[PDB]
Amino acid sequence: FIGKIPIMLRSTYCLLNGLTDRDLCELNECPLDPGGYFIINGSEKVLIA
Amino acid sequence: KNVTLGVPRLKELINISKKPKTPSLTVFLLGQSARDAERA
Amino acid sequence: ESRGFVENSYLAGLTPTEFFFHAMGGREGLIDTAVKTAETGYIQRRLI
Amino acid sequence: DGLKYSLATGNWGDQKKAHQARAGVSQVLNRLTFASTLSHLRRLNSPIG
Amino acid sequence: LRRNEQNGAAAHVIAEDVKLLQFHVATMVDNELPGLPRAMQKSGRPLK
DNA sequence: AAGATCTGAATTTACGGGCGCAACTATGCCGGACGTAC
RNA sequence: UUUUGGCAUAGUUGCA
DNA sequence: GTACGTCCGGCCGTAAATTCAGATCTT
Question: Cα A3 to the chain's mean position, in Å?
């Protein structure tokens, strides 16, 4: 172990990867949510290009 | 012609500067060269 | 039209090139509004 | 913490050298309407430099 | 520097103390000048 | 006459400023050292 | 029986 | 004996500075 990397939502390593809309509803996640952001201390952070 | 105006020119007038952007001399003539194009 | 003379009225609607050149024209209006506000007060405060 | 702080504050570079660090890269995601969220996620920032 | 004089300590350390005191008073009145680096509060932030 | 000096007159870094206010958010400063309990 | 409060930043946004 | 754990020490306008031509002195 060397640390913890924040994970961008709906990436290939987020747990919401490739989940159908039903399973996203079961996890109380909006299927229309595009993702593309991190959760840092509960705050949704987006990196501006 | 093209002469500086607006707030840059007003700035330079109140911010007295040794370097005008568009310094000029509206120089007049008095003899026949005032009316003669060739002489002017 | 190549150098940005738009020929359609606002009623007729602009073409894509015409629309993009018009957006270019309005961008200078926005930027000069911004710089005017940037120079708002400075000349006036110096004068007073 | 090192990623986390940089994503929590948006100051990028060395933490102790944050005086000369580029700021505002990471921003709290703007959840006011769905169009605003999409616009924020697709955003480019041009620094003065 | 006071206990250096009370003890009668060496001169080079006294000069270094005077140097650091000069820097500290100068950055206490004015923490911005084209000389030594700025003073930080041990928290990575300059002093006001 | 010649010179050295030498003293007033042309060229390079270097601070130091940079819109009125509003409104909202969100984030923030340790490692040795010493004891006590188990 | 009469209180109250973090400073300095950074970002975003409104009007001129 | 071992670890923890929590308490104490580390742009443009001046404005100064550097180099070149009279001028009195020096020779």
Answer: 19
Which chain D residues contact residue E44 at CB under 8 A? 15-16, 18-19
A46: three-class secondary structure by DSSP: strand
Q: Resolution, rounded to a tenth of an Å?
A: 2.7
CB C42 within 7 Å, strand F: yes
Could you count the other beta carbons within 10 Å of the beta carbon of residue A37? 24
In chain B, DSSP assigns E strands to none
The Cα–Cα gap between C42 and B11 comes to 10
Question: Which pair of structure tokens corresponds to residue B15?
Answer: 């911010």
d(CA A4, CA D5): 13
Task: Give CA angle at D26 (D42, C27), nearest 5°.
Answer: 50
Q: Which nucleotides of G are covered by protein (CB under 7 A)?
A: 8, 10-12, 15-16
For the purposes of burial, counting CB atoms within 10 Å of the CB of D20, is it exposed (0-12), middle (13-18) or buried (19 or more)?
A: exposed
Q: What is the DSSP letter of E40?
A: B
At E34, give phi and psi (nearest 5°).
-80, 65
Separation between Cα atoms, residue D30 and residue D37, nearest integer Å = 6
**Three-state SS for E8?**
coil
> In this structure, how many other beta carbons lie within 10 angstroms of the beta carbon of residue D6?
22
- Measured between alpha carbons, how far is A14 from C1 in angstroms, rounded to an integer? 50
